[PDB]
């Protein structure tokens, strides 16, 4: 059974906020894939925190922690979030976005540990660079919005060579709104590319006896107007999901 692409309001969120990128959301039970700008979905950027997700699902697989209540020791060094100012544990490095606690991690995988799961995750360009501990915010890796999407299915259907705790870990730990109408698992990141400011919120949301996987990128070329893009991408899937009927 084959997917099909659905068939203008999407894209008037965009123009009416100055920002250009897209939204793509994949409805899982119908097959359907849903564009605001289908060219757009095929362009890779660097990933940013949203690699917190694989990068999450890597260091419970490869024991870099026991489980997701283990802490990392704190360097004592203070940044300028304060919930980082602390030792932390997977599901508050995830939560607190802690570049910090996974970099540390990062240094206990060999980089060719890291190729095997991006070739497994079918993750982007699949590069790592020789920044092997941050090789997600450096522009060497990259991945489209569609292979965001792709690779969230495939973690949603536990189809990756992966514990079966790995999975029930990151699962648990990827909810940041949980409603009685639905389960939102949802992953922002940010970065700059050339005079491009990207904003990522990737995940899937749980509603309607159905799965809706998305990947929301806005570029943005204006400094004075990213903080409240940074604000707002949360509120602008939720827009989307609205104005889609996949919530109220």
């Known amino acids: 059974s084959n997917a099909m692409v659905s068939n203008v309001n999407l894209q008037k969120i965009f123009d009416e906020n100055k920002i250009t990128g897209s939204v793509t ?28 997700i694989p990068n999450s699902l890597i260091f419970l697989e490869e024991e870099v922690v026991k489980d997701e209540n283990e802490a990392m020791e704190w360097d004592g060094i203070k940044r300028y979030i304060e919930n980082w100012n602390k030792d932390l544990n997977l599901r508050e490095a995830y939560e607190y976005s802690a570049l910090w606690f996974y970099m540390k991690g990062a240094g206990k995988i ?15 360009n699949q590069i790592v660079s020789e920044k092997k501990n941050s090789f997600w915010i450096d522009r060497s890796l990259k991945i489209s919005p569609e292979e965001q ?25 990827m909810i940041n709104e949980k409603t009685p109408e639905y389960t939102l698992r949802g992953k922002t990141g940010w970065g700059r590319e050339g005079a491009e400011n990207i904003i990522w919120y990737v995940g899937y949301i749980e509603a309607k006896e159905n799965v809706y996987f998305f990947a929301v990128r806005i570029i943005n070329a204006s400094e004075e107007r990213n903080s409240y893009l940074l604000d707002f991408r949360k509120q602008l899937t939720m827009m989307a999901f609205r104005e889609l009927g996949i919530i109220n």
């Open 149 to 173: 999407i792709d690779f969230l299915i495939n973690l949603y259907e536990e189809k990756f060579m992966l514990s079966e705790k790995t999975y029930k870990i990151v699962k648990d730990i």
């Open 25 to 52: 959301i994949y409805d899982y039970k119908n097959k359907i894939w849903i564009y605001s700008n289908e060219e757009d979905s095929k362009i890779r950027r660097l990933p940013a925190s949203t690699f917190k």
């Open 110 to 124: 060999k980089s060719e540990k890291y190729k095997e799961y991006l070739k497994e995750f079918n993750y982007g």
